Amino acid sequence: GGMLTLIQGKKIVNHLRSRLAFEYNGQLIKILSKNIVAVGSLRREEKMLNDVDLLIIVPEKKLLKHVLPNIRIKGLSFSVKVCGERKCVLFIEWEKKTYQLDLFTALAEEKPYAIFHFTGPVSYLIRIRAALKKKNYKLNQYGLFKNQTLVPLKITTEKELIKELGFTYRIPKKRL
DNA sequence: CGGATCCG
DNA sequence: CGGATCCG
Ligand SMILES: [Mn+2]
């Protein structure tokens, strides 16, 4: 995959917002734009992008086996590099060039944890998770855990989650 | 099928 | 830090 400018990345994301679907028992089901979240370095507003990352919120657990393994993009030709229920890396054709598109899935209850994780950057997440680890927690893209048991937090949004964990909220571009 | 190498 | 996917 080639490099994208921030503007080029946003044009691709806007194009894909209405064009993602998946096959379920032989029927095409379109993914709702509200269930597609730009994440990764594009969400952090980096000037150049190595790839475009999209998080797909899956409303029902029964569909995880179906969404990414049967993912479809209207119009654009693409190839599958790797694909499973949780991560699918595609090489898409866009204006006569090939780019890397990373798709990730989160279930509804995981959404703020997934937004936090997939926004990154890695260095930011490592220091936050290291701090929680010393207090006997484990943080991942699925939830907050203590002794491998989910700790349910009274939060809905990524912002609420970051503050409930004990950290000041930073806008994505300022996370480092 | 698991060490290697991806993903944030 | 923590997790996902598959080449070999
Ligand atoms: Mn990325």
PDB file of C-alpha atoms (C1' of nucleotides) and ligand atoms in Angstrom:
ATOM      1  CA  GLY A   1       0.000   0.000   0.000  1.00  0.00           C
ATOM      2  CA  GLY A   2       1.098   3.551  -0.760  1.00  0.00           C
ATOM      3  CA  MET A   3       1.062   6.623   1.460  1.00  0.00           C
ATOM      4  CA  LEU A   4      -1.966   8.884   1.801  1.00  0.00           C
ATOM      5  CA  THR A   5      -2.296  12.496   2.799  1.00  0.00           C
ATOM      6  CA  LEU A   6      -4.774  13.210   5.576  1.00  0.00           C
ATOM      7  CA  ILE A   7      -7.118  14.735   2.977  1.00  0.00           C
ATOM      8  CA  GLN A   8      -6.805  11.675   0.725  1.00  0.00           C
ATOM      9  CA  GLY A   9      -7.564   9.419   3.698  1.00  0.00           C
ATOM     10  CA  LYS A  10     -10.710  11.394   4.567  1.00  0.00           C
ATOM     11  CA  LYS A  11     -11.932  11.233   0.953  1.00  0.00           C
ATOM     12  CA  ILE A  12     -11.536   7.449   1.025  1.00  0.00           C
ATOM     13  CA  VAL A  13     -13.378   7.169   4.354  1.00  0.00           C
ATOM     14  CA  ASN A  14     -16.255   9.358   3.176  1.00  0.00           C
ATOM     15  CA  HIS A  15     -16.515   7.200   0.026  1.00  0.00           C
ATOM     16  CA  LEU A  16     -16.561   3.961   2.045  1.00  0.00           C
ATOM     17  CA  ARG A  17     -19.128   5.130   4.632  1.00  0.00           C
ATOM     18  CA  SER A  18     -22.049   4.291   2.332  1.00  0.00           C
ATOM     19  CA  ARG A  19     -20.452   1.393   0.466  1.00  0.00           C
ATOM     20  CA  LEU A  20     -19.621  -1.252   3.104  1.00  0.00           C
ATOM     21  CA  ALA A  21     -21.790  -4.373   3.383  1.00  0.00           C
ATOM     22  CA  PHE A  22     -21.558  -8.037   4.329  1.00  0.00           C
ATOM     23  CA  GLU A  23     -23.141 -11.291   3.189  1.00  0.00           C
ATOM     24  CA  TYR A  24     -25.347 -13.039   5.759  1.00  0.00           C
ATOM     25  CA  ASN A  25     -26.843 -16.389   4.716  1.00  0.00           C
ATOM     26  CA  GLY A  26     -26.604 -15.329   1.065  1.00  0.00           C
ATOM     27  CA  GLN A  27     -28.108 -11.840   1.567  1.00  0.00           C
ATOM     28  CA  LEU A  28     -26.291  -8.497   1.360  1.00  0.00           C
ATOM     29  CA  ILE A  29     -26.717  -6.385   4.515  1.00  0.00           C
ATOM     30  CA  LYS A  30     -25.368  -2.853   4.382  1.00  0.00           C
ATOM     31  CA  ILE A  31     -23.362  -1.545   7.318  1.00  0.00           C
ATOM     32  CA  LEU A  32     -24.728   1.687   8.755  1.00  0.00           C
ATOM     33  CA  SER A  33     -22.606   4.832   8.524  1.00  0.00           C
ATOM     34  CA  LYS A  34     -23.224   5.468  12.246  1.00  0.00           C
ATOM     35  CA  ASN A  35     -21.563   2.091  12.941  1.00  0.00           C
ATOM     36  CA  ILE A  36     -18.347   3.047  11.098  1.00  0.00           C
ATOM     37  CA  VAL A  37     -15.741   4.965  13.121  1.00  0.00           C
ATOM     38  CA  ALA A  38     -12.479   6.299  11.705  1.00  0.00           C
ATOM     39  CA  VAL A  39      -9.675   5.395  14.104  1.00  0.00           C
ATOM     40  CA  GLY A  40      -5.906   5.018  13.988  1.00  0.00           C
ATOM     41  CA  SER A  41      -3.647   7.775  12.708  1.00  0.00           C
ATOM     42  CA  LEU A  42      -6.449   9.205  10.569  1.00  0.00           C
ATOM     43  CA  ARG A  43      -8.450   9.916  13.723  1.00  0.00           C
ATOM     44  CA  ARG A  44      -5.295  11.438  15.261  1.00  0.00           C
ATOM     45  CA  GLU A  45      -5.102  13.822  12.254  1.00  0.00           C
ATOM     46  CA  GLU A  46      -1.583  12.841  11.261  1.00  0.00           C
ATOM     47  CA  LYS A  47      -0.455  14.577   8.084  1.00  0.00           C
ATOM     48  CA  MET A  48       0.582  11.374   6.250  1.00  0.00           C
ATOM     49  CA  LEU A  49      -1.055   7.952   6.633  1.00  0.00           C
ATOM     50  CA  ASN A  50       0.392   4.483   6.073  1.00  0.00           C
ATOM     51  CA  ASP A  51      -3.134   3.043   5.879  1.00  0.00           C
ATOM     52  CA  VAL A  52      -6.757   3.800   6.739  1.00  0.00           C
ATOM     53  CA  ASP A  53      -8.239   2.212   9.877  1.00  0.00           C
ATOM     54  CA  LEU A  54     -11.993   1.746  10.310  1.00  0.00           C
ATOM     55  CA  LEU A  55     -13.749   0.347  13.371  1.00  0.00           C
ATOM     56  CA  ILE A  56     -17.071  -1.351  12.646  1.00  0.00           C
ATOM     57  CA  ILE A  57     -19.570  -1.615  15.506  1.00  0.00           C
ATOM     58  CA  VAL A  58     -21.488  -4.893  15.246  1.00  0.00           C
ATOM     59  CA  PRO A  59     -24.880  -4.717  17.015  1.00  0.00           C
ATOM     60  CA  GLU A  60     -25.321  -8.458  17.653  1.00  0.00           C
ATOM     61  CA  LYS A  61     -22.746 -11.032  18.715  1.00  0.00           C
ATOM     62  CA  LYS A  62     -24.210 -13.569  16.249  1.00  0.00           C
ATOM     63  CA  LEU A  63     -22.979 -11.456  13.328  1.00  0.00           C
ATOM     64  CA  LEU A  64     -19.261 -11.508  14.203  1.00  0.00           C
ATOM     65  CA  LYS A  65     -18.802 -14.741  12.242  1.00  0.00           C
ATOM     66  CA  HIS A  66     -20.416 -12.986   9.260  1.00  0.00           C
ATOM     67  CA  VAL A  67     -19.346  -9.344   8.971  1.00  0.00           C
ATOM     68  CA  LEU A  68     -15.636  -9.258   8.202  1.00  0.00           C
ATOM     69  CA  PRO A  69     -15.332 -12.816   6.715  1.00  0.00           C
ATOM     70  CA  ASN A  70     -18.051 -11.769   4.246  1.00  0.00           C
ATOM     71  CA  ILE A  71     -17.153  -8.105   3.898  1.00  0.00           C
ATOM     72  CA  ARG A  72     -18.065  -6.315   0.676  1.00  0.00           C
ATOM     73  CA  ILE A  73     -17.175  -2.908  -0.794  1.00  0.00           C
ATOM     74  CA  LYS A  74     -19.421  -1.597  -3.569  1.00  0.00           C
ATOM     75  CA  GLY A  75     -17.517  -0.569  -6.678  1.00  0.00           C
ATOM     76  CA  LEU A  76     -13.895  -0.745  -5.566  1.00  0.00           C
ATOM     77  CA  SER A  77     -11.749  -3.746  -6.456  1.00  0.00           C
ATOM     78  CA  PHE A  78      -9.688  -5.113  -3.592  1.00  0.00           C
ATOM     79  CA  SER A  79      -7.733  -8.090  -2.301  1.00  0.00           C
ATOM     80  CA  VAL A  80      -7.720  -9.714   1.131  1.00  0.00           C
ATOM     81  CA  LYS A  81      -4.350  -9.860   2.871  1.00  0.00           C
ATOM     82  CA  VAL A  82      -5.524 -11.323   6.210  1.00  0.00           C
ATOM     83  CA  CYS A  83      -9.017 -11.642   7.612  1.00  0.00           C
ATOM     84  CA  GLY A  84     -10.770 -12.965  10.692  1.00  0.00           C
ATOM     85  CA  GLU A  85     -13.744 -12.020  12.825  1.00  0.00           C
ATOM     86  CA  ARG A  86     -11.902  -9.137  14.510  1.00  0.00           C
ATOM     87  CA  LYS A  87      -9.351  -7.832  11.990  1.00  0.00           C
ATOM     88  CA  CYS A  88      -9.440  -7.710   8.200  1.00  0.00           C
ATOM     89  CA  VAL A  89      -6.626  -6.072   6.203  1.00  0.00           C
ATOM     90  CA  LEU A  90      -7.611  -5.198   2.631  1.00  0.00           C
ATOM     91  CA  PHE A  91      -5.592  -3.771  -0.283  1.00  0.00           C
ATOM     92  CA  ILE A  92      -8.062  -1.473  -2.082  1.00  0.00           C
ATOM     93  CA  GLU A  93      -7.812   0.161  -5.507  1.00  0.00           C
ATOM     94  CA  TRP A  94      -8.451   3.913  -5.377  1.00  0.00           C
ATOM     95  CA  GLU A  95      -7.771   6.340  -8.232  1.00  0.00           C
ATOM     96  CA  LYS A  96      -5.421   3.842  -9.922  1.00  0.00           C
ATOM     97  CA  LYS A  97      -3.335   3.182  -6.782  1.00  0.00           C
ATOM     98  CA  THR A  98      -3.353   0.499  -4.072  1.00  0.00           C
ATOM     99  CA  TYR A  99      -3.817   1.390  -0.382  1.00  0.00           C
ATOM    100  CA  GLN A 100      -4.061  -0.588   2.845  1.00  0.00           C
ATOM    101  CA  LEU A 101      -7.472  -0.558   4.560  1.00  0.00           C
ATOM    102  CA  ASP A 102      -7.607  -2.091   8.071  1.00  0.00           C
ATOM    103  CA  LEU A 103     -11.063  -3.075   9.335  1.00  0.00           C
ATOM    104  CA  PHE A 104     -11.737  -3.964  12.969  1.00  0.00           C
ATOM    105  CA  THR A 105     -14.941  -5.029  14.696  1.00  0.00           C
ATOM    106  CA  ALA A 106     -16.276  -4.170  18.128  1.00  0.00           C
ATOM    107  CA  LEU A 107     -19.448  -5.351  19.826  1.00  0.00           C
ATOM    108  CA  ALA A 108     -21.760  -2.683  21.230  1.00  0.00           C
ATOM    109  CA  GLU A 109     -20.685  -3.006  24.884  1.00  0.00           C
ATOM    110  CA  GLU A 110     -16.999  -2.888  23.806  1.00  0.00           C
ATOM    111  CA  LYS A 111     -17.321   0.315  21.767  1.00  0.00           C
ATOM    112  CA  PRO A 112     -15.569   2.882  24.063  1.00  0.00           C
ATOM    113  CA  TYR A 113     -12.771   0.422  24.883  1.00  0.00           C
ATOM    114  CA  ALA A 114     -12.349  -0.301  21.174  1.00  0.00           C
ATOM    115  CA  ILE A 115     -12.313   3.382  20.189  1.00  0.00           C
ATOM    116  CA  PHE A 116      -9.686   4.038  22.889  1.00  0.00           C
ATOM    117  CA  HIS A 117      -7.505   1.097  21.830  1.00  0.00           C
ATOM    118  CA  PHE A 118      -7.737   1.634  18.074  1.00  0.00           C
ATOM    119  CA  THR A 119      -7.156   5.400  18.328  1.00  0.00           C
ATOM    120  CA  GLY A 120      -3.665   4.761  19.734  1.00  0.00           C
ATOM    121  CA  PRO A 121      -0.902   5.638  19.298  1.00  0.00           C
ATOM    122  CA  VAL A 122       0.801   2.529  20.684  1.00  0.00           C
ATOM    123  CA  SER A 123       3.182   4.505  22.901  1.00  0.00           C
ATOM    124  CA  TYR A 124       0.275   6.265  24.633  1.00  0.00           C
ATOM    125  CA  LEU A 125      -1.608   3.008  25.232  1.00  0.00           C
ATOM    126  CA  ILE A 126       1.452   1.216  26.609  1.00  0.00           C
ATOM    127  CA  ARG A 127       2.046   3.785  29.359  1.00  0.00           C
ATOM    128  CA  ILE A 128      -1.651   3.876  30.321  1.00  0.00           C
ATOM    129  CA  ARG A 129      -1.878   0.094  30.425  1.00  0.00           C
ATOM    130  CA  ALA A 130       1.381  -0.169  32.382  1.00  0.00           C
ATOM    131  CA  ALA A 131      -0.017   2.190  35.033  1.00  0.00           C
ATOM    132  CA  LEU A 132      -3.211   0.135  35.322  1.00  0.00           C
ATOM    133  CA  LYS A 133      -1.212  -3.111  35.427  1.00  0.00           C
ATOM    134  CA  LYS A 134       0.621  -1.941  38.549  1.00  0.00           C
ATOM    135  CA  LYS A 135      -2.806  -1.478  40.197  1.00  0.00           C
ATOM    136  CA  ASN A 136      -3.821  -5.080  39.351  1.00  0.00           C
ATOM    137  CA  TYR A 137      -5.904  -4.215  36.247  1.00  0.00           C
ATOM    138  CA  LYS A 138      -5.714  -5.365  32.643  1.00  0.00           C
ATOM    139  CA  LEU A 139      -7.009  -3.007  29.968  1.00  0.00           C
ATOM    140  CA  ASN A 140      -7.678  -4.116  26.398  1.00  0.00           C
ATOM    141  CA  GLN A 141      -9.948  -3.330  23.453  1.00  0.00           C
ATOM    142  CA  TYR A 142     -12.762  -5.336  25.014  1.00  0.00           C
ATOM    143  CA  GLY A 143     -13.020  -3.946  28.551  1.00  0.00           C
ATOM    144  CA  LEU A 144     -11.294  -3.372  31.870  1.00  0.00           C
ATOM    145  CA  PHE A 145     -10.434  -6.549  33.740  1.00  0.00           C
ATOM    146  CA  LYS A 146      -9.304  -7.468  37.242  1.00  0.00           C
ATOM    147  CA  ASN A 147      -8.138 -11.065  37.795  1.00  0.00           C
ATOM    148  CA  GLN A 148      -9.551 -11.831  34.312  1.00  0.00           C
ATOM    149  CA  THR A 149     -13.076 -10.775  35.364  1.00  0.00           C
ATOM    150  CA  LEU A 150     -14.731  -7.871  33.513  1.00  0.00           C
ATOM    151  CA  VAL A 151     -14.987  -4.731  35.666  1.00  0.00           C
ATOM    152  CA  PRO A 152     -18.205  -2.974  34.550  1.00  0.00           C
ATOM    153  CA  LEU A 153     -17.737   0.817  34.510  1.00  0.00           C
ATOM    154  CA  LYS A 154     -20.515   3.440  34.588  1.00  0.00           C
ATOM    155  CA  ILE A 155     -19.477   4.909  31.240  1.00  0.00           C
ATOM    156  CA  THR A 156     -20.789   5.191  27.695  1.00  0.00           C
ATOM    157  CA  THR A 157     -18.270   7.240  25.679  1.00  0.00           C
ATOM    158  CA  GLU A 158     -14.509   6.999  25.132  1.00  0.00           C
ATOM    159  CA  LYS A 159     -14.116  10.307  26.985  1.00  0.00           C
ATOM    160  CA  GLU A 160     -16.004   9.007  30.008  1.00  0.00           C
ATOM    161  CA  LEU A 161     -13.931   5.806  29.909  1.00  0.00           C
ATOM    162  CA  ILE A 162     -10.555   7.594  29.865  1.00  0.00           C
ATOM    163  CA  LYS A 163     -11.483   9.736  32.862  1.00  0.00           C
ATOM    164  CA  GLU A 164     -13.029   6.830  34.808  1.00  0.00           C
ATOM    165  CA  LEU A 165      -9.732   4.936  34.421  1.00  0.00           C
ATOM    166  CA  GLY A 166      -7.950   7.849  36.132  1.00  0.00           C
ATOM    167  CA  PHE A 167      -6.555   9.825  33.193  1.00  0.00           C
ATOM    168  CA  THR A 168      -7.152  13.284  31.763  1.00  0.00           C
ATOM    169  CA  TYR A 169      -8.964  13.286  28.411  1.00  0.00           C
ATOM    170  CA  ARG A 170      -6.835  14.279  25.402  1.00  0.00           C
ATOM    171  CA  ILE A 171      -8.192  14.887  21.926  1.00  0.00           C
ATOM    172  CA  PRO A 172      -6.857  12.178  19.576  1.00  0.00           C
ATOM    173  CA  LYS A 173      -4.299  14.462  17.905  1.00  0.00           C
ATOM    174  CA  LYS A 174      -2.686  15.223  21.286  1.00  0.00           C
ATOM    175  CA  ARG A 175      -2.279  11.579  22.377  1.00  0.00           C
ATOM    176  CA  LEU A 176       1.380  10.621  22.437  1.00  0.00           C
TER     177      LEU A 176
ATOM    178  C1'  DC B   1      -1.092 -25.222  14.338  1.00  0.00           C
ATOM    179  C1'  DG B   2       2.134 -21.941  16.972  1.00  0.00           C
ATOM    180  C1'  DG B   3       6.107 -18.949  16.573  1.00  0.00           C
ATOM    181  C1'  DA B   4       6.474 -14.980  13.936  1.00  0.00           C
ATOM    182  C1'  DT B   5       4.739 -10.930  12.908  1.00  0.00           C
ATOM    183  C1'  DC B   6       0.948  -8.234  12.188  1.00  0.00           C
ATOM    184  C1'  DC B   7      -2.696  -4.412  14.532  1.00  0.00           C
ATOM    185  C1'  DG B   8      -3.656  -0.073  17.775  1.00  0.00           C
TER     186       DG B   8
ATOM    187  C1'  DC C   1       0.678  -3.543  26.930  1.00  0.00           C
ATOM    188  C1'  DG C   2      -2.417  -6.705  24.934  1.00  0.00           C
ATOM    189  C1'  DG C   3      -4.394  -9.252  21.224  1.00  0.00           C
ATOM    190  C1'  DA C   4      -5.205 -11.281  16.149  1.00  0.00           C
ATOM    191  C1'  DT C   5      -4.042 -13.971  12.083  1.00  0.00           C
ATOM    192  C1'  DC C   6      -1.692 -17.505   9.213  1.00  0.00           C
ATOM    193  C1'  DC C   7       2.633 -18.892   6.645  1.00  0.00           C
ATOM    194  C1'  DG C   8       5.464 -22.505   6.492  1.00  0.00           C
TER     195       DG C   8
HETATM  196 MN    MN D   1      -3.066   2.838  10.880  1.00  0.00          MN
END
